[PDB]
Amino acid sequence: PQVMDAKWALQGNCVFLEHIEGEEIKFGTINAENGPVARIQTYATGFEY
Amino acid sequence: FKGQPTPSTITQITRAKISDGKSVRVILSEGESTKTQQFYLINGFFGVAMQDGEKGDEVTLQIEQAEYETDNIVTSEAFEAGKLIYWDNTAKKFTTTSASNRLVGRVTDGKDSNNVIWFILLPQQ
Amino acid sequence: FKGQPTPSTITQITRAKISDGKSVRVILSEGESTKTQQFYLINGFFGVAMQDGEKGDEVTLQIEQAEYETDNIVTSEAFEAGKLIYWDNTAKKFTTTSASNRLVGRVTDGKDSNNVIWFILLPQQ
Amino acid sequence: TKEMKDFNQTFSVEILNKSIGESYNALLNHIHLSPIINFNYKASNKTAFK
Amino acid sequence: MTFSSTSNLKELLRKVVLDVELGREQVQLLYKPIYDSIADSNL
Known part of the structure; x- marks a missing residue:
């Protein structure tokens, strides 16, 4: 297209803590980041002869 | 993250609940020590200590509100079934005296000959 | 059954438990709005709003008595592990000062740098 | 414009040809039936409700 | 856990179009019984 749509994606934010x-x-948690x-x-150019 | 390869916009979305809350991690102060599978009141949380610990060590208190078995009562008092049972931090013993003591459960099975009781841990209001 | 040949008596086998009670459904009044995964006191129930709900909408509050993460504290006060935490409905913020505020939980992690705390939601007293 | 053909994905010559055919058929109904509807009928060719 | 939290982010969700009849109705040639057709190309 003339203008390209922004990407989107999710993530996982789990952190390993001592058990x-x-x-x-x-x-954990998720967040959405978008591009x-x-x-x-x-x-364009041209010629005429 | 830092040094991304492109401009971006992160839309953080919230998540309130983090854990089921059946247990809590508590630091032991200078005068505090714990033994495994025994009741303690550490940092305002009352529950069964799941591990031995000394000062500066981390132990986990079981606060499941389940039915628990204990023997650390004041023997002079009778514990009838259903009596509200309180924790005396000075004596480190379950009592029905209440007064300034913390409320910690309700007796399900009364004091047998061996001074053993069963009680249901209360939600620590 | 309509138009059955003979009369028949309906004996209702009584039961008490209707639902597990982890969450409650409430209807917002004309001065109440909710955002997803945020703490609100609507119709005497305090919990995590599971829906973006405007005035007159139908919103769910989670009252699981689990552990929760909130940044909605009053920043002047100092929240430490074990301190009982109350809800100031006028300011719509958590607060350690009891006063006439509702009792809502107990802090598990103290006030960190970003004023985030972890607490265990107490029952609906 | 060439941009319309290239960038507007939905646009194509099939849509225009469809409208040429439709308006052409509607023309056929008009030129052949308009003499009937639009005529200023005289009293001899008019009949009342009855 | 929080689909109501991701519900506002419409660009993450699938876009499925609700198929509904759009466009002008087809036109029929009604005049034909009323007319006599002569189709000489050299008229």
Whole structure:
């Protein structure tokens, strides 16, 4: 297209903590990151004879 | 992250619950020590210490609100079934005296001949 | 059954438990709005709002009594592990000062640099 | 424009040819039936509700 | 856990179009019984 849509993606943010014998494991989280936009121009020349 | 290869926008989305909360990690102070599978009150949390620990060591308290078995009662008092049971931090013993003592459970099975009781840990309000 | 040949008596086998009670459904009033995964006190129940809900919408609060992460504390106070944590409904923020505030939990991790704390949600007293 | 053909993916000559055919058929109905509807009928060719 | 938290991010979700009849209706040639057709190309 003339202008290209931004990318999107999710992630996982789990971190490994030390686990003592009776610890409740602590859950992770996700975030959404999105990329930038880009567009394409048109160029042209010519001749006449 | 730092030094990305391109401009970007991160939309953090929240997540409140982090763990089921059946146990808590607590630091032992200078005068505190623990033995495995025994009741303690450390940092305002009462529960069964799952590991031995000394000062500066990390131990985990089981606070599941399950039915627990204990013998660390004051023997002079009777513990009938259903009596509210309190923790005396000075004596480090379960009592029904209450007064300034913390409320910690409710007796399910009364004091047998061996001074053993069963009680249900309360949610630590 | 409609138009059955003969009369028949319906004996309702009574039961008490309707749901596990981990979360409660509430209807927002004309001065209440909710964001996803944030703490609100709506109709006497305090918990994590699972829906973006405007006035008049239908919103769910999680009351699982699990461990939760919140940045909504009052920053002047010092939140330490074990300190009982209350909810100031006028300021819509957590606070250690009891006063007439509702009791909502107990802190598991003290106030870090970013004013984030972990606590265990206490029952709906 | 050449940009319309290239960048507008939905656009194509098939859509234009479809509209040429449709408006052409609608023309055929018009030129052949307009003399009937649009005529200023005289009293001899008019009949009332009855 | 928080699909209501990701619900606003429409670009993550799948885009499935609800197929519904769009476009002008087809046109029929109704005049034919009323007319006599002569189709000489050299008229």
